[PDB]
Swiss-Prot record, chains A, B, C, D:
Disulfide bonds: 129-146, 199-230
Protein name: Mucolipin-2
Catalyzed reactions per annotation: Ca(2+)(in) = Ca(2+)(out); Fe(2+)(in) = Fe(2+)(out)
Domain notes per entry: The most N-terminal extracellular/lumenal domain (referred to as I-II linker or polycystin-mucolipin domain) contributes to a structure with a four-fold rotational symmetry in a tetrameric assembly; the structure contains a central highly electronegative pore with a 14 A diameter. The pore is critical for Ca(2+) and pH regulation. The protruding structure formed by the I-II linkers may contain all the interaction sites with lipids and proteins in the endolysosomal lumen.
Entry's transmembrane regions: 31-51, 240-260, 289-309, 319-339, 362-382, 423-444
Recorded family membership: Belongs to the transient receptor (TC 1.A.4) family. Polycystin subfamily. MCOLN2 sub-subfamily.
Biological process terms in GO annotation: adaptive immune response; calcium ion transmembrane transport; innate immune response; macrophage migration; neutrophil migration; positive regulation of chemokine (C-C motif) ligand 5 production; positive regulation of chemokine (C-X-C motif) ligand 2 production; positive regulation of macrophage inflammatory protein 1 alpha production
InterPro entries: MCLN_ECD, Mucolipin, PKD1_2_channel
């Protein structure tokens, strides 16, 4: 009865986990442990999110306060990736001297627990560095002159730094001016929970940048904040965030072992049935377990990166957040496997499998037209439209137009000063919107719907 | 002929109310009284809306005028949930002293019928309360020091309060400063209808809040207005809004009794027919009457809450407005029952009943993907996007993206300073929009349309 | 052969106008004359539009210049239906005195061909009128005190009007202050075409309005411009716009006579065929000619109103523009009749006729839900959302939401200060969007498409 | 066996290029050379785009700096096509004198490598030209008075030009005032790549324009920048962009010869088969090759225009960019031909061919309604809505409304001051949106989908 054994095993392989508890009466660990994964991974993600939100909020608020304190005539919103700009030789001098003078008077201007930090040389002071082209008769070599203005020099009642030869900034040869200083802060919004609060160090840099030499000096403010140790503080669990992460690793490591077992054992079952079929005369490979394995790997990597982040007091979580969020997404998506055996919960996945070939084939022809339109729009409307300035911006604009978004602003944001470009823009926009939206969206939704219809008629036969 | 009786009663149960006037020639109270409900409930809602609009408008305009009078350099729009903000120790002093000095000179600055009210202690004056951390060497206990500045102290020509030790606000230990005062107003826009006008009392509080200790002091203005009695006024129907509400209660109470009778009597008819069916060999439960009962209950509760609100002169109608509006919505929706027997007016409800199982089953699988995307987007794009800052904001953004709204702003509002987060954002957004919109919306509309098609072919057979 | 005659006439009645030129070889006046109508009506509309655009542009630019000249601290954009606002008793005095002083110095401030006009009393001067409640101890009777400030009084070097008792404006009793004056302008942008240019008279009124008595005085500027005769001008065809209008009237009057003939003669043909059908054993009423008759009537009324407007030099064209535009719309729509006989150009009208019953029946049930949602949203979200402030605004917002517009701004523009209203808003918005968009739009498009399918299968059989 | 030869040739004509390598074993030049075209044309377009982006960026930044330097009280954003505006006779004088005085002090105000250029007369100076109506008693002849203010006149310490009779600008007769000057710049952002940098000359013109005579003087700033030769510069490949363009011309010229050969030879094959068919008893014309020929012609013209642009140092690329972008679009679109023989990659083109007749016929009837609505909306809502101001703006707004864009802003941007126009606007907007979106989009998508269905059933039979 080896054929009996083989066919009974094949019957066991395809029955629902509920039915696998009737065929052989065994506990479904790969379902309870997966529910545990969902719960624990979601809790970990939410708690990580809340904590890093607090840290990011503190850093951003301090940066905004720094910009108000040190940038002259700062509205409150950044003009661009740069914060301020100046167009006159006297406005630039005013901005530079304002920054230096506001540094000099920090203790009487700041509304927070700020102080004077220390550079690598361990001195409380300010560094100003200018870059010029060496000398109409200019060379390509950049001269770099730096000065270190200490608080005792700045404090001098008849100040001398203002009349020094360093601050005579020939502007036709000037590339940039940098002001760098260090500040120490204390997060007092944590002390309400009995603890030693977090101490920060801010590496603040102000760049007055005219690399373009086009009349505008762009002013950049960058603050790099790191958590240091509170060396001067007297206020009259990391352990329990490292054991919860260890638990998540344990659950995910177990799920990797169970799922890898199934994938290996499923392949052996296919071998046993293929050999018989050749003797007498994909439904074996489960891609959901391939998804679970990737989820587990990403969760383990994210938990390890998060433990490393907390252990050495880091403040950059972009990679760890990406791993944790993608793992949580994949966990919630893999929940669908435990509703897919159900007789009326699988229309979506079946339709996706049906569609995928036809959908991919369709997107090839539409992709070529989309790429041609992207290149044409970037080359023609790029100088005259801000939704067509960069190739990725053109792609995003075209995708949104296919989804019918900002169609009137896109039409109306082109100026009629050039009539040729305006006419071309009208022709371009009406040809893409018409062609793409109507024809291509019709034929794409129609393919999906006919795949869904084919899936439902098999279900009904 | 007991079977004759039973089958005649079953014929009576399913015929249209117009036909029930031919089978047994009886008045359809449950239709005329329902039309009366529609008319009267809509009139009540509209009149309530107009009156509470007038009251809310007065209160909001007074609040805006208060903000202009007392907040220094107030643009006219709130920055956030807070009204103003300051970043310098001298700006905060200027704001505080400006508020106190503008209170001192209210009679010569206000453009309205304002006056000086009285606190619980029954004295015309101003209260300033500061909160500090008790003392670098700070404790967790918050010291609370308050002063009461009366108009006679403020009026003193060489004022002394400005140089007092209370207003030396150490800012590294400061949590918040509160200014509280009372003002009395008169609504003169009502006197044009011969009456004694409405007298208001405003509990105004200004909070200079730096609980974050991040360099910015947020300034909150809150005005709590209550209607008092006009004790000093000589200007040379509540009854008819309490009898109209009583009429609405009477009509709704009658409708509850009639509809509860039907539901009970319908169950008895089912018993009489089930017993026979077992002898010889839901269409009895009406969910529209279950909706009418809830409508009547909500209308009665709303009318009682509104009568209570007017009787003790309250100015908060959120709960009463919710009850009245939901009752009106349900009344207009239950109007459809009296068009559902019609042979060609019922396609919508029949399609809803057909779809509901399949639609609910479909939304289970799509819901898991939606939740995973919500968590992933909040954890990754939350620090760098304002449409992903909170989990409910992520949900709203994703729902709007499924409906194709603000797709280019969502794509373009992420800064390319971090290239990893930017690339992940692009992948995330294109995967959700593509997957969800195209596949899921196709399969959802297709299910609804096939349910509609099945409903129409039964109608045609 | 009376039956031969009748059936030949019935054959003649339904053949295309091209075929009517073969059956009986007669000129199709009702086609050439209709093409003439299209051309001439469109030319008339375009020319009217251009001329009234010029006039409106002049008037609006003068109004904007008046607002800048006379409104103190005018940004350039109106805050609301009012232009400016003030919150202090000194700001209102400053605004009033600024308006009067800028009137006094008009000849040295204006950048145009402006001058001092004359009131009904024929005096160059300024009128200031204040309204107070007659006198805490205020009455309901409004006292109206007016003063007339002539340029000779204003010109006096030690002015006296500023210290007069008229400008002591008790603000707790004040309703409004009005400043009225007359200015004369000349449109010099017309003189470049040899003519006597257009002379205007501006009735300017500035209202400082505090009818609400809520602390804000709203400032309204209204300028009423009329074209007068140039009595003082020496610059070193109405006939041909009144004969073109007469031609349009003639063409439209002829079309009314021809189309009324057909409608009458068509009814006689129906009588002759109905009588025979009863003897032996709508396709007669043409609704396109009913549309042509309305088009002709509206065109004649619009042309007469436009001739009247030009004849007495009026500057309000809202009614005439409405008539002309609707007539042009209906003319272009009635062009479709002369493509409807074509065998493959009539799918749209046939589908509309098929759908209309079912579409109307469907919109009845959806209309009740829409009205209930409108009332609920206005009553609940009205105080807290500006897209739900008025009932028509609620209707517009709901219609746009059904069309998927501004869904994220609608979700996010509700403040979470009230949690009950916020939760209700979320439930409300997700229930309408879901229900209406998905189910109702599906069932509406499906009805239209099935009507189109039924129309095409008859065409194919 | 001439029939054998003919039928073998006809078999050869329709087999895929891969199969043409089996039938006769020949190299497919028209595929490899087309891939070369794709690669080389895309590289040329991208490189052209990057270079012209750099040039345009420099010119725009210099223009923005010029506006800040010379326009008094310049916010930073243009109000309209004009930059600034003034409403007072003293504001215009201030602006004019500010422009002249900022020109006088350019060397101490500019943040860049700017200098004083020279006019055609070869003198460093400023030209001011005013236009007046010759003289209430004004004539139609425009007097033109000009002055030339040289730096030596401007430099005079007790300046005299300010009190000259030229700057007494009677404003009721004034048409415009022009200030023209020349500046020389150097692009130093190029020197970092060892080269002689680019030298520019700016023809700057400031027009204070009151042609409307409506109280506002519009201020226009226009800067015309051309690349001159660096005559005064000592900084201590065009060849390789002209050989890459020549290569692109060579590849495109070869593709024209090959494709023209096929089109001619295909016609001969049709003749040989038509003659036989008549003896015994479009699939010959390839429109893809007609597209390739146009692509090649446009690419050659664009490359020649770009070589001409670089050869004489031009800075206008609108025509060349249009040619290059359209050629690249058409190249990427013609890539689809080499996926069209594939058995499941041609659904899109087949559906387009099927649909096109029906789609064109449908758009005729919808076009008439669209044109009527456009005219009606422009004539009625034009004075009161900025999305209906011009006929093309009306068309764009209506197209976006059909695509469901900005529906609430369109509804809400009409003011209720005129109730007739407001009611008409509501009726107009709800009738177009309803009719067009629902009915017309349904019938258009339905036609496309039924064409797709007919194409798929032939494929399956
Ligand atoms: C641990 O046990 P656990 O992994 O939780 O349970 C296994 C799974 O149910 C597996 O089915 P899938 O869920 O589809 O992988 C099944 O084939 C195995 O049967 P078998 O032991 O006879 O091979 C079980 O051992
Ligand atoms: C009060 O009378 P009222 O409630 O207005 O009228 C009743 C309803 O018409 C009910 O039908 P529904 O409208 O479907 O509930 C019907 O079964 C009852 O017949 P019956 O009296 O023989 O039981 C009527 O008495
Ligand atoms: C003027 O002549 P006109 O109105 O231009 O032409 C008439 C129309 O063609 C009419 O058909 P419709 O276009 O459908 O109204 C037709 O029935 C009449 O035939 P009849 O004269 O024998 O009655 C014609 O006289
Ligand atoms: C150069 O040769 P080339 O143009 O690259 O190749 C030609 C094409 O393959 C052409 O088919 P299409 O691609 O459809 O035009 C085919 O008819 C010609 O066969 P023939 O030479 O026997 O006429 C070939 O010579």
């Amino acid at each position: 009865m080896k054929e009996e054994c083989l066919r009974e095993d094949l019957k066991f392989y395809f029955m629902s986990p509920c039915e696998k508890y009737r065929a052989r009466r065994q506990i479904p660990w790969k379902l309870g442990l997966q529910i545990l994964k969902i719960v624990m991974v979601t809790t970990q993600l939410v708690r990580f999110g809340l904590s890093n939100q607090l840290v990011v909020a503190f850093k951003e608020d301090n940066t905004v306060a720094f910009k108000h304190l040190f940038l002259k005539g700062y509205s409150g919103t950044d003009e661009d990736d740069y914060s301020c700009s100046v167009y006159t030789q006297e406005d630039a001098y005013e901005s530079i001297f304002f920054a230096i003078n506001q540094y000099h008077q920090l203790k009487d201007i700041t509304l927070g627990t700020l102080g004077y930090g220390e550079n690598e040389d361990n001195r409380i002071g300010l560094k100003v560095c200018k870059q010029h082209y060496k000398k109409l008769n200019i060379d390509n070599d950049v001269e770099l002159d730096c000065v270190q203005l200490d608080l005792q020099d700045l404090s001098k009642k008849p100040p001398d730094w203002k009349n020094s030869s360093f601050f005579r900034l020939e502007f036709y040869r000037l590339l940039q001016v940098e002001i760098s200083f260090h500040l120490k802060g204390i997060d007092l919004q944590t002390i309400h929970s009995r603890e030693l609060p977090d101490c920060y160090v801010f590496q603040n840099t102000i760049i007055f940048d005219n690399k373009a030499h086009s009349g505008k000096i762009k002013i950049y403010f960058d603050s790099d904040a790191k958590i240091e140790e509170c060396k001067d503080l007297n206020i009259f669990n990391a352990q329990y965030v490292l054991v919860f992460d260890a638990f998540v690793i344990v659950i995910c490591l177990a799920s990797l072992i169970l799922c890898t077992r199934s994938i290996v054992l499923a392949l052996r079952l296919r071998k046993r049935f293929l050999n018989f079929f050749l003797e007498k005369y994909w439904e074996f490979i489960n891609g959901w377990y391939v998804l679970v394995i990737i989820s587990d790997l990403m969760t383990i990597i994210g938990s390890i990166l998060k433990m490393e982040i907390k252990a050495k007091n880091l403040t950059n979580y972009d990679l760890c957040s990406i791993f944790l969020g993608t793992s949580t997404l994949l966990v919630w998506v893999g929940v669908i496997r435990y509703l897919g055996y159900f007789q009326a919960y699988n229309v979506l996945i079946l339709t996706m499998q049906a569609s995928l070939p036809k959908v991919l084939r369709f997107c090839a022809c539409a992709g070529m037209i989309y790429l041609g339109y992207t290149f044409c729009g970037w080359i023609v409307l790029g100088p005259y439209h801000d939704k067509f300035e960069n190739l990725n911006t053109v792609a995003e604009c075209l995708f949104s137009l296919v989804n019918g978004d900002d169609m009137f602003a896109t039409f109306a944001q082109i100026q009629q000063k050039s009539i040729l470009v305006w006419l071309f823009s009208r022709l371009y926009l009406y040809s893409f919107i018409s062609l793409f939206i109507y024809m291509i969206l019709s034929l794409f939704i129609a393919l999906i719907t006919d795949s869904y219809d084919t899936i439902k008629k098999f279900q009904q036969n």
